[PDB]
Design a protein around this ligand. Structure first.
Ligand SMILES: *[C@@H]1O[C@H](CO)[C@@H](O[C@@H]2O[C@H](CO)[C@@H](O[C@@H]3O[C@H](CO)[C@@H](O)[C@H](O[C@H]4O[C@H](CO)[C@@H](O)[C@H](O)[C@@H]4O)[C@@H]3O)[C@H](O)[C@H]2NC(C)=O)[C@H](O)[C@H]1NC(C)=O
Ligand SMILES: *[C@@H]1O[C@H](CO)[C@@H](O[C@@H]2O[C@H](CO)[C@@H](O[C@@H]3O[C@H](CO)[C@@H](O)[C@H](O[C@H]4O[C@H](CO)[C@@H](O)[C@H](O)[C@@H]4O)[C@@H]3O)[C@H](O)[C@H]2NC(C)=O)[C@H](O)[C@H]1NC(C)=O
Ligand SMILES: *[C@@H]1O[C@H](CO)[C@@H](O[C@@H]2O[C@H](CO)[C@@H](O)[C@H](O)[C@H]2NC(C)=O)[C@H](O)[C@H]1NC(C)=O
Ligand SMILES: *[C@@H]1O[C@H](CO)[C@@H](O[C@@H]2O[C@H](CO)[C@@H](O)[C@H](O)[C@H]2NC(C)=O)[C@H](O)[C@H]1NC(C)=O
Ligand SMILES: *[C@@H]1O[C@H](CO)[C@@H](O[C@@H]2O[C@H](CO)[C@@H](O)[C@H](O)[C@H]2NC(C)=O)[C@H](O)[C@H]1NC(C)=O
Ligand SMILES: *[C@@H]1O[C@H](CO)[C@@H](O[C@@H]2O[C@H](CO)[C@@H](O)[C@H](O)[C@H]2NC(C)=O)[C@H](O)[C@H]1NC(C)=O
Ligand SMILES: *[C@@H]1O[C@H](CO)[C@@H](O[C@@H]2O[C@H](CO)[C@@H](O)[C@H](O)[C@H]2NC(C)=O)[C@H](O)[C@H]1NC(C)=O
Ligand SMILES: *[C@@H]1O[C@H](CO)[C@@H](O[C@@H]2O[C@H](CO)[C@@H](O)[C@H](O)[C@H]2NC(C)=O)[C@H](O)[C@H]1NC(C)=O
Ligand SMILES: O=C(CC[C@H](Cc1ccc(C(=O)O)cc1)C(=O)O)NO
Ligand SMILES: O=C(CC[C@H](Cc1ccc(C(=O)O)cc1)C(=O)O)NO
Ligand SMILES: *[C@@H]1O[C@H](CO)[C@@H](O)[C@H](O)[C@H]1NC(C)=O
Ligand SMILES: *[C@@H]1O[C@H](CO)[C@@H](O)[C@H](O)[C@H]1NC(C)=O
Ligand SMILES: *[C@@H]1O[C@H](CO)[C@@H](O)[C@H](O)[C@H]1NC(C)=O
Ligand SMILES: *[C@@H]1O[C@H](CO)[C@@H](O)[C@H](O)[C@H]1NC(C)=O
Ligand SMILES: [Ca+2]
Ligand SMILES: [Ca+2]
Ligand SMILES: [Cl-]
Ligand SMILES: [Cl-]
Ligand SMILES: [Zn+2]
Ligand SMILES: [Zn+2]
Ligand SMILES: [Zn+2]
Ligand SMILES: [Zn+2]
Lengths: 682, 682
């Protein structure tokens, strides 16, 4: 028999292990020769594995690299202390110059000299507290911020808008050093010389900064750097906590406002500005010489043509490019994808084909702003929006070994529940129990007893263009840590095969479980006669999110009275969606007729699509999903959430509340419009 | 048998006559009680006729009306001459106060006093000639322009940008009085007291000025008038040629530059500014007191559910609202639609159903900016873009009685050729010959011997949102005049049943022929197993339009060398489209399998859709069709055409030619992307 069980049983832990080892012996930085060679290997092997076609899709995109003969560093100035030029390489590692040293991708060049201010996590809330409560002024200062809480690019944006002339990012042990675990190579903790790489862009979903809206192909017209989307305007550099201690220990001015501003280092965590008395005259100087360069990148796209609906695509995609060895990020994911392709190809060789086409993707330049997936989606956007059933992401399969973590559209909730009930838990103490049981026990729903937590999709990985721009139902699953105790070695040189094999998943059973969840989801989406989406699950969360956004607005009762701010239309639309989805589910259960089926499958496939506004969100044309797009000021209903954010500070309240009302109208309309796609069609 | 012939034979000239009489006895101005009553009648009758459902879809949109107790007029100033307060009503007509007097819909209020300048047709080219060749300055002047050549709103926009403080529009006998035909009521010519009504908006496809992007429903948030889309900023009023003669006869300053600036009146046609010597001190004063008011409008939407593909829509739509009696505009069209519905309902009562759903529409407020069709399309945009097969318009069936005039997407060319070969010519001297033969003889293709002229769809009628914003294959057909000899009584009170019955089509045979063409197109689109679109026809015209746009650019060889302006990518994409479409047509001929069929029918339906750019054209987000959107500066490829327009006057040629290159890249990409929708799907 060729069914899901056949597919699932063919997956082997030992194969995922071999592929992970194979993928992590040398660095695979985007735009480098080694990553092109890995793309060619993957293309060859996917053909060997049995896919119908396997092609490279290349683009020429803006990337960013340190200058090899002119290293980046930070000084206290005579330069009396210098930060490191590289992380101490891990034991046994030999090509150390082709290891890219830590840097913040897309930093402009510069050598700003100045006095330090300590901005905690550089969140919106942290900057509000600096300026509004503490009357501290960041203008012309170098800010030093600790990583964590939010995307690092949001820190640099937040810093820019507060007027800073440089940002230093560092990893504080409070956030990145787990109590009682030994540092690499003897455990999975971050040593003091370790440094988190990462881009610092604010693209708002645009992809390559030079070609927003269109693929960076052979004839593309590019914006000048001056007009580019999302580039930072001030120099930025990341450092480890040994180097951070040296910079923070002399900090003067105001004490931290409270304990939530103090990390774990033996320093006061004084906010500044500037150093204390004796050193009040010393300064901090950045030396940043990185360059932005248009560089070729390569996606591998594998096709397994569907037997019955070859014009319906189920996509399994994850990135291949890594900062250095990519032992977790992304090769723990890519090894999983490779074994999934191998398993599907095994059934294919025996004569089986999925009902719908499966597309497999190995994305390039994910670490530089989701560039490979976004350019490919811009190139193929018409095919994807009329044919795209679903997108399952496949980055890092493990970031811990505690339990499963799923983020997806509500359309996939029932699919995920049903699948995980049929899979074996790999967890200690849950031998012979289902993954659903272990996951539900370790990560309970905050709302429903006997159900697991499933989170929303936001931003920051390759599902983003498919879900937030194109409105294709999307999901992701991986194994994660206990969230009451990212991960220490994230984007550091110490992310190695040995890290994973010794400390995360020596038996590769968590990898195998993640292969079963991702692979099983893809199998159902591509083979089930009726698409495995339950529109009733969207109705339930829409009411929750409407309740939530109403509750935020209701912090301002006087203004809602004055400006006649009603959420009645939004609740009405949610109620109608609930009633219509209920009736549609009845019809879906109550229908031999493949036109009615495919009509019904089309209604299910285009339901996610109906939440797209072709006008996008305000000033963010590439975020178009009205329920789930990222907030500019990071809740769901982001248009209304952003209109309400810090509304009490707006100088023209009439105008501000008018815009809240406009967003309520757009949201109610969109909800009702999506509901009407599930009505009888004529 | 229930086939096309059965459908066509059921259509009767005598029924179209009765309906026209029924629809034209009282005025049906948008937003008035009489037009709501007509909507309710049509809804009732379409149900009687046998449609499955017939609903009113209402919206509350910005409309514009004269003040009944404060009439609009123009003076020479002591006011020594006044223009008319109304057109002399036609013989036998009794409710003359409910006849709206001539006015320019959406004019602001005002009483500007000043000196006249005569701007010919107020085209872009005419204003270029005034300022650049004749050194005449329109700033602070009242411009008087004759109707014709271009849309009247473009005249007011062109006037505004040249700095004028008022516009007077008039109908010159050179353009609106056919030689040797007697004026109404004794013939079809425009009498001197007749006046062309019409809106003067510049909406660029937005629909209701207050709700761009979203339906003007019960909970809509509206822009303030100050922020509205497309409203004119200076007062405007139209007059007839008796009144125009009085205003023009004293005109001084510069003589007309050439004969193309002189109409037929016994006046010099001096451009001005101002009057001659003795009257050099007299001025012109407008009195405009019209008001813009949000008003309810009603579309009638009839559904005939498809037997096999009820989720695929073929739409036949035309407007119902008229300036006064609507004898030609639109009731000659609406009477045709009514008889088409009656004929389809006759087959339905005998047990027949079309393969695909047919939607019938009676649009409101077309005369005020395509408001009814646009709001309905904004409300239903998700259904329309995933399900909309085609849209056939149905405004005025006759504007003359010489021959057929078709404007449509190239996807419909073969359909139109094949249908007209099977229909009887109603033309004198072509008894027993096909409509194709008569039409081809009277309106030859400028390019191909033995084929008729078919024009492009542009702007200015209710197909606009479906084709230019949503990318649904669209077409229109009507009977027209000999274009080497609009029509004289256009938008005047003299457009009556008697005008049509006495002077245009006494036997209703031209009406019947137009019913057969529109109805037959709808029949094929809704019933043919394979959609009746030939993608090869798009390949042919894309090469033509690429040749044309290249030829325009090649007027600037030096700049194309300097800025490296290549059209190579666009020709490459057109070549690929040609090859791919050729292969797709082979597959379409060479395939029992309803999935392959419906896959193939989906590829045909979404081919028009693939020419939509979701980023729209520059500053015109609602014009999104990359091949055919209206030029801002009114050729096809409007993005590239507008980038090239008057490029030699741009102050920064590097920037201007960079933008030309950007548009070439967008167009080439879009063509290639559309081509790829016709590739094998996996
Ligand atoms: C959820 O679904 C329900 C349908 O089950 C849908 O109900 C619709 O609500 C609107 C109100 O927003 C109704 O609109 C009315 O339509 C009638 C004609 O049918 C008009 O006469 C009404 O206008 C008068 O009353 C207004 C309100 O006081 C006045 O402002 C106005 O000036 C008029 O005097 C009004 O337009 C509509 O009939 C129903 N449709 C039904 C029941 O089929 C509801 O809108 C959906 N929710 C959302 C968010 O779409
Ligand atoms: C019309 O369809 C044809 C396919 O039949 C399609 O041809 C493609 O054209 C592009 C050129 O625009 C080719 O791109 C090349 O791809 C190879 C790898 O396959 C690269 O090595 C090439 O890059 C090198 O050469 C460049 C040109 O001098 C240099 O600028 C560059 O730095 C590299 O040195 C180049 O990217 C592509 O291979 C074909 N694809 C085929 C034949 O399958 C054509 O593009 C279509 N037209 C449009 C408008 O899409
Ligand atoms: C990763 O595995 C690949 C595939 O097995 C290895 O690539 C093969 O290497 C052998 C020996 O050089 C060649 O003969 C094959 O042609 C290669 N096959 C390909 C590229 O498809 C590769 O050597 C392994 N890498 C590491 C670091 O172990
Ligand atoms: C930090 O690094 C800089 C640059 O390498 C050091 O300053 C240089 O010292 C070298 C050799 O001693 C001189 O040739 C250069 O003139 C110096 N350059 C600059 C820019 O200062 C600096 O001494 C280092 N600081 C520490 C504490 O090691
Ligand atoms: C998840 O599994 C449940 C239990 O099997 C599925 O719900 C059943 O679906 C069948 C087929 O429609 C119905 O006949 C039953 O009434 C359903 N039981 C219920 C709702 O309790 C559910 O459809 C599955 N989810 C999927 C496939 O997405
Ligand atoms: C146009 O035709 C309609 C439909 O036949 C006429 O409306 C009918 O009028 C009679 C007499 O008043 C009523 O009993 C019917 O209820 C009406 N039917 C409808 C509205 O569906 C209408 O009178 C005709 N108009 C003119 C000007 O001749
Ligand atoms: C044009 O119309 C205006 C307004 O009706 C005429 O001027 C008015 O004349 C009436 C009665 O004779 C006076 O009561 C008003 O004071 C006048 N109003 C204004 C605004 O001037 C004017 O005479 C008419 N011109 C002609 C030639 O008939
Ligand atoms: C218009 O009519 C022509 C002539 O019948 C149709 O072209 C024929 O189509 C059939 C069925 O595919 C083929 O077997 C013939 O080879 C075609 N003849 C040709 C191309 O000369 C054409 O398809 C019709 N157009 C439509 C239906 O849109
Ligand atoms: O590095 C990434 C983005 C990672 C994010 C998850 C994440 C986010 C933050 C951290 C950290 O601060 O350690 C770690 C992991 C995602 O949503 O996948 N892509 O390759
Ligand atoms: O009045 C209209 C728009 C009419 C236009 C055609 C047109 C355009 C101009 C005239 C004229 O100047 O007499 C007459 C008719 C269309 O493309 O349908 N809609 O109701
Ligand atoms: C890198 O720095 C070196 C040495 O100072 C310099 O010569 C070169 O211009 C730089 N390279 C780039 C790509 O900017
Ligand atoms: C893997 O799980 C076991 C049990 O908690 C433990 O030894 C180790 O800390 C875990 N690894 C990581 C990286 O959490
Ligand atoms: C119309 O004009 C009259 C009479 O001068 C005036 O009283 C009224 O305000 C006006 N009506 C509108 C709707 O502006
Ligand atoms: C209708 O056609 C005949 C023949 O040309 C003619 O008497 C009359 O002028 C035509 N009517 C119009 C409006 O062109
Ligand atoms: Ca791009
Ligand atoms: Ca609107
Ligand atoms: Cl993932
Ligand atoms: Cl028409
Ligand atoms: Zn990753
Ligand atoms: Zn990463
Ligand atoms: Zn009309
Ligand atoms: Zn009209």
């Amino acid at each position: 028999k060729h069914n899901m069980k056949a597919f699932l049983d063919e997956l082997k832990a030992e194969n995922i292990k071999k592929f992970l080892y194979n993928f992590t012996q040398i660095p695979h930085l985007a735009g480098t020769e080694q990553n092109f060679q890995l793309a060619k290997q993957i293309q060859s092997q996917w053909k060997e594995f049995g896919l119908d076609s396997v092609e490279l899709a290349h683009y020429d995109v803006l990337l960013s690299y340190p200058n090899k003969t002119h290293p980046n560093y930070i000084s206290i100035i005579n330069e009396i202390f210098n930060t490191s030029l590289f992380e101490p390489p891990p034991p046994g590692y030999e090509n150390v110059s082709d290891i890219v040293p830590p840097f913040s991708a897309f930093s402009p060049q510069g050598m700003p000299e100045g006095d330090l201010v300590y901005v905690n996590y550089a969140r919106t809330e942290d900057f509000f507290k600096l300026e509004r409560d503490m009357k501290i002024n960041c203008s012309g200062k170098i800010v030093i911020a600790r990583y964590g809480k939010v995307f690092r690019g949001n820190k640099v944006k937040n810093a820019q808008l507060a007027g800073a002339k440089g940002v230093i990012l560092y990893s504080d042990p409070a956030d990145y050093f787990a109590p009682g675990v030994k540092s690499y190579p003897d455990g999975w903790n971050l040593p003091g010389g370790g440094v988190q790489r990462g881009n610092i862009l604010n693209l708002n979903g645009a992809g390559d900064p030079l070609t927003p809206g269109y693929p960076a192909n052979e004839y593309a017209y590019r914006r000048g750097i001056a007009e580019a989307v999302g580039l930072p305007s001030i120099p930025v550099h990341p450092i480890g906590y040994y180097d951070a201690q040296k910079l923070l220990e002399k900090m003067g001015g105001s004490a931290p406002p409270d304990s939530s501003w103090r990390g774990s280092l033996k320093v006061p965590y004084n906010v500044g500005p500037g150093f204390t008395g004796n050193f009040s005259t010393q300064k901090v100087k950045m030396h940043i010489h990185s360059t932005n360069e248009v560089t070729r990148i390569y996606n591998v796209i594998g096709t397994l043509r569907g037997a019955v609906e070859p014009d319906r695509y189920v996509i399994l995609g994850g990135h291949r490019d890594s900062w250095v060895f990519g032992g977790i990020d992304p090769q723990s994911g890519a090894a999983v994808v490779h074994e999934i392709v191998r398993s599907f190809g095994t059934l294919k060789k025996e004569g089986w084909r999925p009902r719908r086409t499966i597309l497999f993707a190995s994305w390039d330049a994910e670490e530089f702003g989701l560039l490979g997936s976004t350019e490919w989606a811009e190139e193929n956007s018409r095919l994807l929006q009329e044919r795209g059933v679903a997108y399952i992401n496949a980055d890092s399969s493990i970031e811990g070994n505690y339990t499963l973590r799923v983020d997806c559209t509500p359309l996939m909730y029932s699919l995920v529940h049903n699948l995980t009930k049929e899979l074996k838990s790999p967890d200690e103490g849950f031998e012979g129990k289902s993954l659903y049981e272990s996951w539900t026990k370790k990560s309970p729903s905050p709302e429903f007893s006997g159900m697991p937590r499933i989170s929303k999709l936001g931003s920051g990985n390759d599902f983003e263009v498919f879900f937030q721009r194109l409105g294709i139902a999307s999901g992701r699953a991986r194994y994660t840590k206990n969230w009451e105790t990212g991960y220490p070695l994230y984007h550091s040189v110490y992310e190695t095969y040995e890290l994973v094999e010794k400390f995360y998943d020596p038996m590769f059973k968590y990898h195998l479980t993640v292969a079963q969840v991702r692979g099983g989801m893809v199998f159902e989406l591509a083979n089930s006669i009726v698409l495995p989406f339950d529109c009733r699950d969207y109705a339930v969360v829409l009411r929750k999110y409407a309740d939530k956004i109403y509750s935020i607005s209701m912090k301002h009762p006087q203004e809602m009275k004055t400006y006649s701010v009603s959420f009645d239309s939004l609740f009405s639309a949610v109620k109608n969606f609930t009633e219509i989805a209920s009736k549609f589910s009845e019809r879906l259960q109550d229908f031999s007729n493949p036109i009615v089926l495919r009509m019904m499958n089309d209604q299910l496939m285009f339901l996610e699509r109906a939440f797209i506004d072709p006008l996008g969100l305000p000033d963010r044309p590439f975020y178009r999903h009205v329920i789930y797009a990222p907030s500019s000021h990071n809740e769901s209903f982001p248009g209304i959430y952003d209109a309400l954010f810090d509304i009490e500070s707006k100088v023209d309240p009439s105008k501000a509340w008018g815009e809240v009302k406009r967003q309520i109208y757009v949201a109610a309309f969109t909800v009702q419009a999506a509901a009407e796609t599930l009505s009888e069609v004529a």
